[PDB]
């Protein structure tokens, strides 16, 4: 009887040069209708890179998921820190009004998908992170149900996310 959020990796090992994609997953966010989050990395170990292959610059929005592609007025806005390695990212609902209408909230499926090149092969971890800038935050995640409040308790947050875990001890 669960509700949570996870960053799932679709490779568990990966060499120099591959490209590892987090998805960012949300399971059964009652009303759900957006998020701020603060997600950290090794910026030694993982570079972010849009589908195209470049870097992600201060104000790169992470790639498109599943959900929170609908025409209800989408404010999004990035501001990342890539020498620190930290995402921090906003994506909402404007029109709460249509949405709660629509009567279909999206409570389920892949917010945001991040790219990340492998520079060195090393274990390596991606989660969500505190942060002062969000001072309302559970374990780095702010997520919003669609009367524009903030979901208090009753959610997991599952992390980190761990690639190369088979060549920890080196680490």
Same mark, same amino acid.
């Given at each position: 009887p669960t509700s949570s959020i996870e960053i799932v990796l679709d490779k568990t090992t990966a060499s120099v040069g591959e490209i590892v994609t +987090?998805?960012?997953?949300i399971k059964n966010i009652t009303n759900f209708s957006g998020c701020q989050l603060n997600m950290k990395y090794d910026p030694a170990v993982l570079q972010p890179v849009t589908s195209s292959g470049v870097a992600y %610059?201060? =104000? @790169?929005?992470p790639g498109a998921g599943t959900i929170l592609n609908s025409d209800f007025n989408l404010r999004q806005v990035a501001d990342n820190d890539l020498e620190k390695g930290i995402l921090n990212f906003?994506? +909402? #609902?404007?029109s709460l009004d249509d949405y709660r209408t629509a009567a279909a909230p999206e409570q389920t499926g892949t917010v945001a998908v991040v790219k990340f090149k492998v520079l060195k092969e090393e %274990?390596?971890?991606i989660s969500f992170?505190? %942060? @002062? =800038?969000?001072?309302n935050a559970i374990d780095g995640t702010?997520?919003?149900d669609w009367n524009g409040d903030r979901i208090?308790?009753? #959610? =997991?947050v599952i992390q980190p996310a761990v690639i190369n875990l088979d060549m920890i001890k080196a680490s």
């Open positions: +987090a998805s960012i997953n %610059t201060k =104000s @790169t929005m906003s994506k +909402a #609902y404007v %274990t390596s971890s992170e505190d %942060t @002062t =800038s969000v001072p702010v997520l919003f208090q308790s009753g #959610y =997991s």
